[PDB]
């Protein structure tokens, strides 16, 4: 779910199992630096690929000129009855025609998808 790097030579960390204490042991095999990982996860792959695109969308896309501009469907944190709607248009990441609403206020940026 996440990776980190070595400390004193600053290299990439590889897994290792421990023969005695039976705990997974991430280690740099360019070194002898051994430590445990609290995540206890090494590999995950969402093959159907239902990632959350709410973190994917830049908060500054709303201030685009050539994007659409609706008047209904107001924002949540602020009222601001004006918003922009568009689609993801990302290849290989699903086929949904469902719309991605972003608030267009200069200091807002709470985006929602209904």
């Amino acid at each position: 779910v996440g990776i980190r790097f070595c400390q004193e030579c600053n290299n990439m960390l590889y897994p290792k199992e421990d023969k005695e204490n039976r705990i997974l042991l991430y280690a740099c095999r360019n070194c002898d630096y051994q430590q445990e990982a609290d995540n206890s996860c090494i590999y995950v792959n969402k093959i159907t690929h239902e990632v959350d695109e709410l973190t994917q969308i830049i908060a500054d896309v709303s201030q685009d000129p050539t994007l659409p501009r609706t008047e209904d469907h107001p924002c949540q944190k602020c009222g601001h009855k004006e918003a922009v709607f568009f689609q993801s248009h990302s290849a290989r990441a699903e086929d949904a025609m469902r719309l991605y609403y972003v608030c267009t206020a200069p200091h807002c940026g709470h985006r929602w998808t209904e």
Binding site: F85, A96, M97, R98, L99, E114
Partner: protein, 48 residues
């Protein structure tokens, strides 16, 4: 015989009636409203 009776084509063979033009514009408007309706259904994710 065509030398006598004569064949042609012109603007008058392309002009339709005003009622015809109104019907064509109504059909086009209805088609545009229907495609707006189906794309609105596709926007809110109800198109099976």
């Amino acid at each position: 015989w065509l030398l006598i009776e004569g064949h042609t084509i012109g603007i008058g063979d392309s002009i339709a009636d005003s009622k015809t033009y109104q019907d064509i514009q109504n059909t086009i408007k209805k088609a545009k409203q229907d495609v707006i309706e189906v794309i609105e259904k596709a926007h809110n994710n109800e198109l099976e």
